[PDB]
Write a protein that binds this ligand. Structure first.
Ligand SMILES: COc1ccc2c(CCN)c[nH]c2c1
Ligand SMILES: [Ca+2]
Length: 223
């Protein structure tokens, strides 16, 4: 997160870290046994880390649970990033409490101008590299589809939206991939892609979760 703020320990209790020996992506807990992330975060040997604030210090609220199955969306296209969404099933159910909580799926799509919360442990610099050890937060509005398509001509599908600031300076970044975009208490986006971080006229692009609710619900009822 570039230009954000320190969230505060366990104030984003649905945020997860995906760990393969080191943090490599974020995700969101949607119930006691399932995590949503980006399909471009797929890999084998994933351990899901819940209840994290400092990812380098055991602070006492964490739960570490291995993944038992990963399901990339059937129409994911890694070249265009269309359908950049994946489900991860935990080997055992998480224990839900004040520090580890699920986020609800949306019933309708969020509208332009709505302010949302994006979080993650990714790079905090738009030029150079500095990686924080504590969770960072950013408030950003959903941008109109016409501004989004003008920023990324020929590249925005119906399954994407832009959020952020056309002036730059505030954005998600490398290492925030797969993390949540939450608006009005619902999961509306997944950190997906962009042209760099926090550059002028190049806002972040996010997977439009409201288009996937039926697939999510059907998949978790049968696996
Ligand atoms: C390798 O550099 C990057 C830079 C930025 C991003 C993002 C979000 C950009 N808003 C997702 N993956 C990335 C990879
Ligand atoms: Ca920790």
């Amino acid at each position: 997160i570039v230009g954000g703020y320190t969230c505060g320990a366990n104030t984003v209790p649905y945020q997860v870290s995906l760990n393969s020996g080191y943090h490599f992506c974020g995700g969101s807990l949607i119930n006691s046994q399932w995590v949503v992330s980006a399909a471009h975060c797929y890999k084998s040997g994933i351990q899901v880390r819940l209840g994290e604030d400092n990812i380098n210090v055991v602070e006492g609220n964490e739960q570490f649970i291995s993944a038992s199955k990963s399901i990339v969306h059937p129409s994911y296209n890694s070249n265009t990033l269309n359908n950049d969404i994946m489900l991860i099933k935990l080997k055992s159910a998480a224990s839900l409490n004040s520090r580890v909580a699920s986020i609800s799926l949306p019933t309708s799509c969020a509208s332009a101008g709505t302010q949302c919360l994006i979080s993650g442990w990714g790079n905090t610099k738009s030029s150079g590299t500095s990686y924080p050890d504590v969770l960072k937060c950013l408030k950003a509005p959903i941008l109109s589809d016409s501004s989004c398509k003008s920023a990324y001509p020929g590249q925005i599908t119906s399954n994407m939206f832009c959020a952020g600031y056309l002036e730059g300076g505030k954005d998600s970044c490398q290492g925030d991939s797969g993390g949540p975009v939450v608006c009005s208490g619902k999961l509306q986006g997944i950190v997906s892609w962009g042209s760099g971080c926090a550059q002028k006229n190049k806002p972040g692009v996010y997977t439009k979760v409201c288009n996937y609710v039926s697939w999510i619900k059907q998949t978790i009822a049968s696996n």
